[PDB]
Amino acid sequence: MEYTQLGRIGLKVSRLVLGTMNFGPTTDEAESHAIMDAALDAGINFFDTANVYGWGENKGRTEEILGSWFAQGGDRRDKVVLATKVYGNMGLDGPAWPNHDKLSALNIRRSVDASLKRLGTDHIDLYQFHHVDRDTPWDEIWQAMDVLVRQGKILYVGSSNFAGWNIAQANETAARHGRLGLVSEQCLYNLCERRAEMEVVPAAREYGLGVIAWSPLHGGLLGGAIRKEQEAADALKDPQQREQIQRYEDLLDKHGLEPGEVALAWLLTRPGVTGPIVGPRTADQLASAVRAAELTLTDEVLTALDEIFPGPGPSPEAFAW
Amino acid sequence: HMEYTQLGRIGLKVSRLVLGTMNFGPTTDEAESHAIMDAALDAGINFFDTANVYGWGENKGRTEEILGSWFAQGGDRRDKVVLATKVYGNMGLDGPAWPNHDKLSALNIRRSVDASLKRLGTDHIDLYQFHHVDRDTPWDEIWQAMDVLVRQGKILYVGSSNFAGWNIAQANETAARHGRLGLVSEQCLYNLCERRAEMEVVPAAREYGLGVIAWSPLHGGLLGGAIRKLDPQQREQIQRYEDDKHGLEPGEVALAWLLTRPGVTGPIVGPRTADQLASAVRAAELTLTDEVLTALDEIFPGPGPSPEAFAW
Amino acid sequence: MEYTQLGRIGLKVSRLVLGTMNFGPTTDEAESHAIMDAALDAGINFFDTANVYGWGENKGRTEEILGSWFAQGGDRRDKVVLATKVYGNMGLDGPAWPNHDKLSALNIRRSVDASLKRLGTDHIDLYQFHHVDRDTPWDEIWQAMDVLVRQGKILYVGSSNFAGWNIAQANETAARHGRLGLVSEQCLYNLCERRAEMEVVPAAREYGLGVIAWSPLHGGLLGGAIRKEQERRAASGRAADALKDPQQREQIQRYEDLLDKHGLEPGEVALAWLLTRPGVTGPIVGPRTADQLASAVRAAELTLTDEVLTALDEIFPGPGPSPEAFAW
Amino acid sequence: MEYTQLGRIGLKVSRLVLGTMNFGPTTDEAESHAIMDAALDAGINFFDTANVYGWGENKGRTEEILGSWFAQGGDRRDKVVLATKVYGNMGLDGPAWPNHDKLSALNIRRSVDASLKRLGTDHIDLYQFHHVDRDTPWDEIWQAMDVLVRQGKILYVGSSNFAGWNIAQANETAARHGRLGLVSEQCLYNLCERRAEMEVVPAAREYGLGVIAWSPLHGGLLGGAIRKEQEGGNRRAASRAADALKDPQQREQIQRYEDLLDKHGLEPGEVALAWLLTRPGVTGPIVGPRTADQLASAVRAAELTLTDEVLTALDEIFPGPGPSPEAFAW
Amino acid sequence: MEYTQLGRIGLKVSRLVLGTMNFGPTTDEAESHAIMDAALDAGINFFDTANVYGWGENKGRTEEILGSWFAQGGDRRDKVVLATKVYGNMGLDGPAWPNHDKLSALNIRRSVDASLKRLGTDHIDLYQFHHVDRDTPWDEIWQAMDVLVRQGKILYVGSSNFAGWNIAQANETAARHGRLGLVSEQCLYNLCERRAEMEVVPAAREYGLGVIAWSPLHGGLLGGAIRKEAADALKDPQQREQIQRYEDLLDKHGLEPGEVALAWLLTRPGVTGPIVGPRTADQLASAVRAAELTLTDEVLTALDEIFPGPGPSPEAFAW
Amino acid sequence: MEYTQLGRIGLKVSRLVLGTMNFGPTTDEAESHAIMDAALDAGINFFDTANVYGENKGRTEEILGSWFAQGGDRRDKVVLATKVYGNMGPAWPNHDKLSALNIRRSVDASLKRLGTDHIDLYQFHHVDRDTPWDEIWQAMDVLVRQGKILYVGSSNFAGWNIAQANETAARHGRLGLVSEQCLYNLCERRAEMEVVPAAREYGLGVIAWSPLHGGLLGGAIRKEQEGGNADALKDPQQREQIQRYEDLLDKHGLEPGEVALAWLLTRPGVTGPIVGPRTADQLASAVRAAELTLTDEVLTALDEIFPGPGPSPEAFAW
Ligand SMILES: NC(=O)C1=CN([C@@H]2O[C@H](COP(=O)(O)OP(=O)(O)OC[C@H]3O[C@@H](n4cnc5c(N)ncnc54)[C@H](OP(=O)(O)O)[C@@H]3O)[C@@H](O)[C@H]2O)C=CC1
């Protein structure tokens, strides 16, 4: 298994990040524990979850399943870098009660509290914002994170679904008063959606953040979608995206490569990318993700992939000069 | 149903009505207070204002005790409310305080928040407010004491009440020097009869991004139907105000008028019945015409900002 | 009773500070308790003690006597601003085991924990360095004090037996990172010893520290020691050595004669004088009896005339501030 | 016993530092306790240990031996400046599991908690990085140490096996935000290996760190190793490690050393220690007695006064470099 | 001509730095002028000088030659990144009058004004400390350099012959009060002398300084010294043997010693480039060829075994 | 000639400081110039003057100016120190003391008289309790940045003034005071209570003025007994100190004036004494005093005769 520093910090993580979103709604408790044991066996030490995972009435269920996993002992907690998230509404689906979503110091205090209890652990290694909150200023956010840092309840802070300039503002404000800033950004990044390349990834590289790609298969659209319908994806409605996926599936047919694996290995070549979040439901899907991390894509396949799935390049050049 | 706003520049979202709490104890009883709070919650009011001195005399603290009773019932009550209380007041025998048993020394702040947390039956206050400026305590002392509480998780935010504008500036410049969040709100005396917050308090609050909470929004009930059930000048000002020509109830218009003022978060309302609360709710939905605002401005003129209020 | 702000900070204190050094080695526990009750009854809210007080094998006795006073209830702890000290050796008298005296963060951690236990309280209001430690830098000291402030174990930090430039360096270092600095300096200052006037008091005034004067009667020398010489702290220590030096002896003789003539008591005048000195918060009185405490209270109501102030200045000239004190 | 301040800070330490490496592997629990009690009686108040001490499956055994020492009472914990270390892999020897070695905030947090539990104490006086970690930035390290300071789990932070410029960067970063920086550096420094003089000791002195010399006898090569080879007579026929001092350049240095010391009547183990005590900016050497007898010998080396003739001749045998840049440029 | 950034800053410099030490005491005005025009022609934009160059009673002569060169117009001044130095005694050789050497604000002020006058220009681009001064604190030094920056007499500050920790202290002090720190360090670094790798180069890399290698041929000892029979170190059998293995190997691969020593430096991590000291047009052309040379990995490997480096501290002496 | 760093900074100065106050009517312009050339010849590079030196105020600075105008590298070799604070005209408001207004006009008048474009060391002549340091540092920082001055020094400060000044300077990157001129000699040692300990903490040079205590340490009892024309020689106890001092020096064959200067050079943190020779034989006597080595026996005896106070707080408390 390949390891890398998470951006600029001393933390070392697996380039494959185990996502936990399916633990609860798809795989049951014991099945999820087995997948986590097997991720560990393959050397994956980086586990991403969220308070909202579980969905609907079951929000928090994913954290509970990792909690019972840690409760089996055998150094599981000691060995994993535990990441979870704050921002999302934990009450009834629909419009949240005020301050029961987003990034106020008040929601941060109550959110991390409920996460620690469901996770059955006394600390979170990587506490991430699930989305930028334009209404909370960074001196409030860093006050609330710093309370947690100094109680030993969290080690590191990261973001998800930020703009590039939010990364810059967040870390400049942290650095002004001697605080470690964001250590990582979780952005939607895959062959079909490359616009994090304009500004999010350049800002992250500048400020030394790890870049973790969520929806690395674009919701399955890059995992052999077309071949599976012959045996969201309202993209296979639009014939331009459909023809794009077709050329992709055809291209990988002639190089003998699995699309679900190629999509992951492609992200691993991109400058600044720490790795994709993989969400296997079975032992075969985990082993396939591991193979994707050992794949070496030829220049030939990389060039043709860029021809099918062009990227915008960095701003300002992407739209001006 | 209820209108919400950010509290000044910060991430906290509050209802534009602030549930006052001073009646709980003296006027309404524990059972009636509990039921008004349950009602406020169901109308969407999340912002409750209280003070340690509330209850008065030998009953100072009774109000905080009543809110603790309410929280102890469970049912997401503590979780749903932005709880604001106050420090400054003597909690001992009325009359001259023993030294450091009132005002804002780090010593009185330590003893006040401990006694407030115990009576409130909660491990934290969301918004801990100075009841009054203390000219004798410097801001590096006050911010030390508040930072001890912030870092213990005992409080989240700091607000002020009865500050001058320049105290607001000094307090927040001092906090920002060393990374700390400053005052997030100022609770000032603001209503149609008393507009001198407009000279400097409200302008400083808006420059520093504080929410403005208006206490005594009906000027002691003088703006809520007085001569239609104290003087020769005061009466005929109110009489022009209380003149049906436009079809509106005075008490609700005094609240709604404050909601039009730039920088104002909302007023502190103090309902004693669920029907008074339902009126306050409608006050927050009212739209006053450019008509009625221009006329209110001639009955109750305001000073404007300094320096123009008194120079040019 | 007159109250004042302690220097620039919001803490209000009585202009008389109750000293406790006598409680244990010269005044027993029960009468210590009576004096403290009388002090509280007269409006004195500011008590000074030290870990070392008690002396010898009884170092810590004074704190323990304060502890059992608080334990009697009646709001005593809540009403009193409690000050103690760190620096002194709490082990066997003589050369200290390394880091069991002075102001390292290590001695600070162990010293405050033992003080809180002997005082039977969870916080000290005013925690004072007993003496400057030239070997500990201020970033180490402010680290250790800041740990205590953030845990709630102390509120304020003060100094004792500092030079003026130590006050400056300390508070400039604290302010650089937004810490409240020293709030008070407890220095030797009385009619017989006025050299804190050169730099310590000017620096304290500049930086807004309170100034509380220790041994305000010079160990009882200024309390009628000559009249009382054959019948007591004045029979020992500072006072007794001063009485054997003829010039100091003469100074005190002129002092007791001047007060005989004006119908005033020496102990009370010595305290009243300190109360006139600019920047002085108050003297730390050292009653051995309840009588002497009621006497200090009378001192706090005395008004000295210009005539008396000028004659005292003639007997007990002071240097005034540096650089003028020794240059121009 | 001679005391000194540890660099610029208020902490006072004996100029002999009691190393504990041999407690567990070569000395057993009860003799380790007796050595620590005899160190205290000689005035030594400065104990240096490490989480890794113990070796192999027994990593942490040394910290446990100190813990049972402290648990005897008698003001033992109160009298000792306790130092330990973080950086080393505490699991099975070999490649470490990610973040189970080096200086991430994650490993600092788990390493100190495990050391406090083994040491049977609620705080460490001097918590030292065993080695520079080029992959962890100083705002991450200082955040982790600052959490421990503010919780009261540690008092002072030190380094070991740093470059001079790591010392400067660490303490400049700490000073920016009012944090006390490194108070001490533990570098390899002895007659045979003097290259710490180029930049490590200069930087430590500029920034006011104490300098603690580890391996002051260069693994025993300055402790009379050549005489010790010809020691047993017939015992050398036994079925015994190969002799380790083969580099002829260094072997002749050691011969000249032992001859010089024979000429002047001095003990090689004592001189190596006392020499370090003359070097500018050095606090003291770490002494690793395996017996009460070895301790008395180190204590004698602390009271030894080396004549200027012997100091001159030792310098001729073991020349140091200058400070940089002069050592290699001008 | 290969260009690079000078460490972390926006200044772009050729990977060859034109030294001017020989201008005066070896080449005279007219020929140094030709060497400088030819350096411009090959794309070299980075000229290194010093106030002391010229030697003895001719100290300042080199700067005077650059001044007479710039006075010929033709965009010479505009095209060149001009670097000079302060620290050296500019008076009578031997013991210096107090404050007429080293880095006091006193010596800095008189030193830069005399340099500017001799260079015939109103600004120096890169003003370098010739050597660390352990007796002048960095708040004094940065005060003096900041005066020169704000008056527009200098743009960047650099160092020469610092220890690694001096680089760190210098730039941490500058950054605390909003000053650009050192942008480059000039160290003795070549195949024969690699101890800059212990700490100096690693500190420069951490703080983003360019690394300029001076005496890259070790006094000419690496430019074919034994065939063409300070660099007189040849007496020592140990080093003369290094040099013969060196010349022998490059004879076998068909390579010129003076060009390999330069090209080797261009492969070292964090190195900006060597300062070359041509006395003729032939030597400049040679250095240019050196900047174009690609050393194979078996030559770099054999050069390593002949000229081992220490590696970085602490590993170099401990672990 | 012995040199030293001026406190913590990179400036190197001779441990004798040539004062210019005693340039007067027994001292030509021409004889002042000769003395200054002789000082340069002896290796003294540190010249101290003041604007008020000279009702004929500024004349001293003018004499230095014409000295510099002779050329011969005189300006370039000398570390030139002058002062601001004194009235140069009861003073008209802001024509004395340390306001930015008086600093600006004083330095301009000083540079004109001195006939130079810069002062190396510009010193406050006295503490000004009414001007805050952020004002003072603004005005000095303007001069630093214009190149008109290099370093700032103090004179007749309290130790806590030194601390406050340099802490304030360092907050915003500025070089603080580099030197303090204080009254300091065997008879007056109270600068050891706080001034010198602060100066040493903050790394200032200490320049001792009135090093002979107005001549009291220059053999004043011998001169009285020899007959023919401050007086503490009427004070019995102060007289006995000076008598013990002159007896001690007679027994060891040492000159009172020279020993007073040599003693100061042994004191911790002292850069040197100001000397104001009116003749060239007085200068050579000062140079010999800087060469003298006082035995430890003599230094112990001088401490018995002239006990120091110790540092505060120990000086008066414990
Ligand atoms: N920080 C430091 O270094 C020090 C601090 N302190 C603090 O200062 C306090 C006071 O010091 P202390 O030396 O006791 O003070 P004093 O100088 O007042 O000496 C006390 C003695 O003065 C006499 N006395 C006290 N009050 C009166 C009165 N009203 N009328 C007449 N005589 C009186 C009594 O002498 P007699 O018994 O002879 O009648 C008494 O024992 C101490 O309690 C301690 O807290 C003290 C010493 C050092």
Author numbering:
A (entry chain F): 1 to 231, 242 to 331
B (entry chain D): 0 to 228, 246, 248 to 260, 263 to 331
C (entry chain H): 1 to 231, 235 to 331
D (entry chain B): 1 to 239, 241 to 331
E (entry chain E): 1 to 229, 242 to 331
F (entry chain A): 1 to 54, 56, 58 to 91, 95 to 234, 243 to 331
Question: Would you copy out the relevant sentences from the publication that reported this structure?
Answer:
Aldo-keto reductases (AKRs) are a superfamily of oxidoreductases capable of reducing carbonyl to primary and secondary alcohols, found in all phyla. In this work, we identify the enzyme AKRtyl, which is responsible for tylosin reduction. Phylogenetic analysis indicates that AKRtyl is the founding member of subfamily D within family 12 in the AKR superfamily. Specifically, by combining steady-state and transient kinetics, X-ray crystallography and molecular dynamics simulation, we demonstrate that AKRtyl exhibits a positive synergy mediated by an unusual Monod-Wyman-Changeux (MWC) paradigm of allosteric regulation at low concentrations of the cofactor NADPH, but an inhibitory effect at high concentrations is observed.
We solved two AKRtyl crystal structures in the purified state. They differ in space group and asymmetric unit with resolution of 2.30 and 2.32 Å, respectively. Each structure contains cofactor NADP(H) carried from E. coli purification and we confirmed that the cofactor is in the oxidized state. The first structure contains a complete octamer in the asymmetric unit in which two subunits are bound with NADP(H) and belong to different tetramers. Of the remaining six NADP(H) free subunits, a long cofactor-binding loop (approximately residues 230–241) are not fully observed in five subunits in the electron density map due to disorder, whereas this region is visible only in one subunit that presents an open state. In addition, a large cleft suitable for NADPH binding was formed above the TIM barrel in all these cofactor-free subunits. Cofactors are indeed bound in this cleft as demonstrated in the two subunits that contain NADP(H). The nicotinamide ring on NADP(H) is π-π stacked against Trp214, and the carboxamide group makes contact with Ser160, Asn161, Gln186, and Trp331 which comes from neighboring subunit’s C-terminal tail loop. To summarize, the eight subunits in the first purified state structure all belong to the active conformations, while the second structure contains half active and half dormant conformations which coincidentally camped based on conformational states to form tetramers. Upon further analysis, in both structures, we found that the dormant tetramers have no NADP(H) bound but the active tetramers bound at least one NADP(H).
